[PDB]
Design a protein around this ligand. Structure first.
Ligand SMILES: Nc1nc2c(ncn2[C@@H]2O[C@H](COP(=O)(O)CP(=O)(O)OP(=O)(O)O)[C@@H](O)[C@H]2O)c(=O)[nH]1
Ligand SMILES: Nc1nc2c(ncn2[C@@H]2O[C@H](COP(=O)(O)CP(=O)(O)OP(=O)(O)O)[C@@H](O)[C@H]2O)c(=O)[nH]1
Ligand SMILES: O=C1CCc2cc(-c3ccc(C(F)(F)F)cc3)ccc2N1
Ligand SMILES: [Mg+2]
Lengths: 429, 438, 334
């Protein structure tokens, strides 16, 4: 049990979270009935805990549909496995953030509470305890951020006990549709970061670049990339939920990940990381996964791994690994770079093997660590915001948003304080 | 006769014990159902039988074991397994909430709820059973569960039982690597306090043993199960001696008391010889000298150590298969004459060692081929202490980092306790040195 | 600059609870020495000793008034100068956070403050506030008029980066002593935190009491501020066996006390980043940390051998406090 509520919100997440849930549902292999197509008991139970059983042994997905606009959900519902979710389960505000973090934030909240309360009550009832909640949205886009800001505080607030991780796409520093767009995100995220114990973010640009490049497709599709992302998430859920020869609890890992709880968050990493052609055609050798992970390319976000430093790296292997393989992988890491390895703590990386190899490739791994460069880059973006501040464009709209300037300043300010530490991360090995 | 129960802590504890038990069933030939199609256990309930299980029902043998885990995961497997059918649900218990590899957290949070059931469960068995000569403890140092669980367990068990002997087969993080950052914190913190309560503590060289076994295997990597397999078999040998008299059977504990001159030295390091891989088993027919000599070599040593570096205050020998004391003597001369093993001035005498009539016990599906004789030895060296120190330093570094204070802080555990672990380690090292010196 | 942050250690007379404990006084206070010595044992039996030399050292015997006189009176003059000053009490409840607060200290202080000021003859106003920090949240004690939580948010006022502004709390000025008391009594009730199993009373929340004094004389205008901070302390949850919520809350603070261990290792470090913002307390505190504010610390310790950890932890913190360079400046304003 210990189900976590899945949230899709923000239009991005309106896709992306939906994609994740749906793909996860696909992972369920439960037929669209919501009964369990899959023969496998193991999946069935794990999924089953995840998804409350409707009569007919339907699986009630743990998700809420949030609409920037109501159509978005509609598209979702019209999209596949609409049936699996009972329409009752989700409700979404029509208004949405409006792609304003603040504006969405203020407006959304009233709707938010109503929706959240009902679902949350159900969910709370649903499992004895939830491990935590997962949020999908795009911070960079106005709504993910706008909704998130309002939602996160209360939602986190409701159970201090619960540990929640949030997912948002961070705006690509490379380009933004609008300067303002990341602006909505920045305030949201800044507020968000303290609020949320864990945040998982990948820069859009890098993901697109990597995805695209790897794909060698004309472009990465939004959905596909989301699918990739969801896949990344899914493994974590699947592996942890699923038995593993070595399985690590979220709590231990999470606590472990920060050398102490002070470190707010760690940035996600995915494995195997490969090019579209490369990965698809290629099969991972045992060392193979590690190597891909090791390289910069592996990180979904674009970072130079040297530039970043890893507080820790964690990978979850899925399926069995040879102990020797365990040895080889571990050994390589330390060898590879002194700085890369944290000097302070040996065995920086800890891995768990999923009891069962993932659907598809036998071995899967996740990447854990932070990208120094990436975090720093983001802060720069805020600086861009600062420059924009010189413009003081759309102050009024912000005024309409009702957020004070000071929040803006502080929001940057705290970030500024943190960011320096970020460099420090790299500085430390 | 006497029955023993094993306790498994952490996933590791359960798994390892699991290996132990099934082996027992197989060795008895008792079917995993728990009632052997084979005739009733040897000599009826033999001492071995009773410890392994009891014949009740009647005409069912139910193992004497308790399986505990914070995390539901491993125990559920048991439920799945056929062996599960053997084990009546009373014996097997699972815990909802995993340690999450916090020794303190797991210990405090989990332990409180769990203990009452387990103590009761054990209690009833204990009451019913004639008793154990001793009981075995399984757990993982690294695993939070083992850490937290063991600490809770140790005090309570110690207080209640008092007289009853306690033995802990623990997993010592290989100096090569630690799975988790937590592990050094967990291990040191957990270990020191508990150990004092415990008569003796055992730690495993994951690296050394794994390397050695694997290398002996000449296999890329031993299975974890296989690795466990080695552990089980040796244990079985241990049980066999006490359970069934060998050429020489000795009270294991009583001998052990002889073995450890000091309660100060909770346990001598123990070795099993010959070091037998499957291949190693294949390669030679062991001789008394051969086994002993093999045993001496660090390759045999599961732990990585320089036996030279440590002194041998005394060593014990277990014997398996046919043996004749003459051969033993021949070995004795060989060993004694050999400089290489150093004897502490304190103990002039190698003695004593015991022999088992029955050929060495093997773990089922044993990777390694059978050896004519199995032997185990205890030695006390400074070096062994050093290994602890080796782990300690990293922990010390962690303490220097003062990282992750908070998590423990949530536990309410103090740095001072940790410091105490370190200091205790230091003192212990000093003690080990002091004893170690001849 | 500034005078170094002043740290005094006080060893409590063996608490009656200590007596029930049959706690034994390892602790030896040699006030002449200003040495305090603790039977560590080290590894060894607590023949082994750890000896510290303190700015000021008070054995159990030390009378309360005396302590105050020695520590408060000099502070009061700084307040009148315009100093911003802070005194924080740490250590064991038995040691007498409670022994110190039950009696003054607070009731005594407001009387003296007016007496010194009026004899000074300066035209003055006195405003007081009382808040409690509970589970990282702010709650207004002082004004029951104000909510149980004062509307609490804190921002940087650009004058001092460390310098902060706590919007919404009000101190109400009264020229007279008397008005203050009336508030004082009121405030106290709000202030009170949870009692403990171990101790009849415990401070669940850190209490911050602040008195701001505006002074005008013929024209020079000075503002003096005094913060009297009473530590909130936790006990090991496991030991407590307290309800999970209770344990949790204790754990949070306790853990926070590591985080307070951590920032203070940084101050010693003179490390680039000081984690002020990781606690509301240290952020508020922030400008005081070796800051312009004139700061004094009173660490209380129990002779009892029983609590090794607190004794060790108070010894480490006394070292770490000195390291940070306190730059009290008289904040005299004309
Ligand atoms: N990787 C992806 N990024 C996307 C996708 N759709 C949008 N985005 C990015 O997300 C940001 C826009 O956020 P959303 O899609 O969530 C718009 P939202 O409902 O949150 O608010 P409004 O602006 O009120 O509509 C922006 O940076 C886009 O580049 C997608 O499918 N995948
Ligand atoms: N003797 C063995 N040790 C093992 C085996 N597999 C893992 N380990 C070791 O066990 C340690 C991990 O401990 P556990 O899995 O028992 C974890 P535990 O349940 O105690 O706590 P958590 O999983 O953190 O909640 C670590 O040092 C591993 O290297 C095995 O098959 N045998
Ligand atoms: O690096 C270190 C070592 C631990 C330490 C403890 C404290 C503390 C912890 C607990 C208490 C109390 F509970 F006894 F009050 C007092 C001070 C303050 C600073 C430090 N710095
Ligand atoms: Mg949208």
């Amino acid at each position: 049990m210990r189900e976590i509520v899945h949230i899709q919100a923000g239009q991005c997440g309106n896709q992306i979270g939906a994609k994740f849930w749906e793909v996860i549902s696909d992972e369920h292999g439960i037929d669209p009935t919501g009964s369990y197509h899959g023969d496998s008991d193991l999946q069935l139970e794990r999924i089953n805990v995840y998804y409350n059983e409707a009569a007919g042994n339907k699986y009630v997905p743990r998700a809420i549909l949030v609409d920037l606009e109501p159509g978005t959900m509609d598209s979702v519902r019209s999209g596949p496995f609409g049936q699996i979710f009972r329409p009752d389960n989700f409700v979404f505000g029509q208004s949405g953030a409006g792609n304003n973090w603040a504006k969405g934030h203020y407006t959304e909240g009233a709707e938010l509470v109503d929706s959240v309360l009902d679902v949350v009550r159900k969910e709370s009832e649903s499992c004895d305890c939830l491990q935590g909640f997962q949020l999908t949205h795009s911070l960079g886009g106005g709504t993910g951020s706008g909704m998130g800001t309002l939602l996160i505080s209360k939602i986190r607030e409701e159970y201090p006990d619960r540990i929640m991780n949030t997912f948002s796409v961070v705006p690509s520093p490379k380009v933004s549709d609008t300067v303002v767009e990341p602006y909505n995100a920045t305030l949201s995220v800044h507020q968000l970061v303290e609020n949320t114990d864990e945040t998982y973010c990948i820069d859009n640009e890098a993901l697109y670049d990597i995805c695209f490049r790897t794909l060698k497709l004309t472009t990465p599709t939004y959905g596909d990339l989301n699918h990739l992302v969801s896949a990344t998430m899914s493994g974590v859920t699947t592996c942890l939920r699923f038995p593993g020869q070595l399985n690590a609890d979220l709590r231990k890992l999470a606590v472990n990940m920060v050398p102490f709880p002070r470190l707010h968050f760690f940035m996600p990493g995915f494995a195997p990381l490969t090019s579209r052609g490369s990965q698809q055609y290629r099969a991972l050798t045992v060392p193979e996964l590690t190597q891909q992970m090791f390289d910069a390319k592996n990180m979904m976000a674009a970072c130079d791994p040297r530039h970043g430093r890893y507080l820790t790296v964690a990978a979850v292997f899925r399926g069995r690994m040879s102990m020797k393989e365990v040895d080889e992988q571990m050994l390589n890491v330390q060898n590879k770079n002194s700085s890369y390895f944290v000097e302070w703590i040996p065995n920086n990386v800890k891995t768990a093997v999923c009891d069962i190899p993932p659907r598809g490739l036998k071995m899967s791994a996740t990447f854990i660590g932070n990208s120094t460069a990436i975090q720093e880059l983001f802060k720069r973006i805020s600086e861009q915001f600062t420059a924009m501040f010189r413009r003081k464009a759309f102050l009024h709209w912000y005024t309409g948003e009702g957020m004070d300037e000071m929040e803006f300043t502080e929001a940057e300010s705290n970030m500024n304080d943190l960011v320096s530490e970020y460099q420090q991360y790299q500085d430390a090995t | 006769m006497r029955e023993c129960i094993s306790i498994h802590v952490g996933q590791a504890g359960v798994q390892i014990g699991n290996a132990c038990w099934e082996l027992y069933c197989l060795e008895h030939g008792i079917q995993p159902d728990g009632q052997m199609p084979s005739d009733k256990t040897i000599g009826g309930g033999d001492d071995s039988f009773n410890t392994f299980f009891s014949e009740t029902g009647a005409g069912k043998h139910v193992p004497r074991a308790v399986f505990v885990d914070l995390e539901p995961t491993v125990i559920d497997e048991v439920r799945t397994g056929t062996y599960r059918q053997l084990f009546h649900p009373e014996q097997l218990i699972t815990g909802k909430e995993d340690a999450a590899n916090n020794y303190a957290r797991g210990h405090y949070t989990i332990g409180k709820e769990i203990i009452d059931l387990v103590l009761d469960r054990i209690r009833k068995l204990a009451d019913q059973c004639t008793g154990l000569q001793g009981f075995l403890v399984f757990h993982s140092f690294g695993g939070g569960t083992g850490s937290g669980f063991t600490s809770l367990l140790m005090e309570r068990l110690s207080v209640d039982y008092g007289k009853k002997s306690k033995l802990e087969f623990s997993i010592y993080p290989a100096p090569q690597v630690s799975t988790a950052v937590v592990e050094p914190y967990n291990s040191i913190l957990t270990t020191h306090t508990t150990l004092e309560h415990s008569d003796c503590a055992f730690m495993v060289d994951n690296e050394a043993i794994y390397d050695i076994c694997r290398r002996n295997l000449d296999i890329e990597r031993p299975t974890y199960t296989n690795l466990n397999r080695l552990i089980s078999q040796i244990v079985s040998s241990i049980t066999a001696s006490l359970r069934f008299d060998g050429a020489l059977n000795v009270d294991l504990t009583e001998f052990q008391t002889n073995l450890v001159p000091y309660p100060r030295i909770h346990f001598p390091l123990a070795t099993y010889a010959p070091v037998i891989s499957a291949e190693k088993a294949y390669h030679e027919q062991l001789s008394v000298a051969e086994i002993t000599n093999a045993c001496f070599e660090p390759a045999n040593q599961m732990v990585k150590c320089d036996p030279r570096h440590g002194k041998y205050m005394a060593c014990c020998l277990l014997y398996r298969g046919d043996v004749v004391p003459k051969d033993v003597n021949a070995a004795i001369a060989t060993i004694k004459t050999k400089r290489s093993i150093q004897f502490v001035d304190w103990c002039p005498t190698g003695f004593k060692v015991g022999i088992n009539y029955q050929p060495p016990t093997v773990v089922p599906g044993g990777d390694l081929a059978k050896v004519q004789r199995a032997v185990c030895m205890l030695s006390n060296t400074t070096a062994i202490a050093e290994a602890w120190a080796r782990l300690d330093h990293k922990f010390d570094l962690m303490y220097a980092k003062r990282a992750f204070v908070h998590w423990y802080v949530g536990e309410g555990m103090e740095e001072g306790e940790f410091s105490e672990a370190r200091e205790d380690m230091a003192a212990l090292e000093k003690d080990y040195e002091e004893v170690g010196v001849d | 600059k500034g005078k170094n942050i002043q740290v005094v250690v006080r060893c409590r007379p063996f608490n009656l609870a200590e007596r029930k404990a049959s706690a034994h006084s390892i602790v030896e206070c040699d006030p002449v020495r200003k040495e305090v010595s603790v039977r560590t044992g080290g590894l060894a039996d607590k023949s082994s000793r750890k000896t510290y030399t303190f700015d000021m050292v008070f054995g159990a015997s030390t009378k309360q008034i005396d302590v105050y006189r020695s520590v408060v009176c000099p502070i009061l003059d700084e307040v009148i100068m315009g100093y911003n000053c802070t005194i924080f009490a740490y250590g064991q409840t038995g040691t007498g956070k409670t022994f110190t607060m039950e009696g003054g200290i607070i009731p005594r202080t407001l009387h003296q403050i007016f007496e010194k000021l009026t004899d000074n003859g300066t035209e003055f106003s006195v405003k007081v506030s009382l808040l409690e920090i509970y589970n990282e949240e702010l709650f207004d004690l002082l004004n029951p008029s104000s909510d149980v939580s004062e509307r609490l948010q804190m921002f940087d006022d650009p004058r001092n980066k460390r310098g902060v502004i706590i919007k919404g709390l009000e101190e109400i000025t009264v020229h007279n002593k008397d008005e203050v008391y009336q508030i004082l009594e009121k405030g106290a009730a709000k202030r009170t935190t949870a009692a403990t199993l171990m101790n009849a009373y415990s401070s669940r929340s850190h209490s911050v009491f602040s008195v701001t004094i505006h002074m005008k004389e013929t024209e020079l205008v000075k503002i003096g501020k005094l913060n009297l901070v009473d530590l909130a302390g936790s006990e090991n949850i496991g030991r407590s066996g307290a309800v999970d919520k209770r344990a949790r809350e204790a754990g949070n603070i306790n853990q926070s006390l590591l985080t307070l261990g951590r920032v203070i290792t940084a101050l010693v470090e003179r490390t680039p980043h000081v984690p002020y913002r990781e606690s509301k307390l240290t952020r508020i505190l922030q400008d005081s940390l070796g800051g312009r504010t004139r700061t004094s610390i009173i660490a209380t310790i129990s002779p009892a051998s029983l609590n090794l950890e607190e004794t060790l932890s108070t010894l480490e913190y006394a070292h770490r406090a000195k390291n940070i360079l306190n730059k009290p400046e008289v904040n005299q304003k004309l």
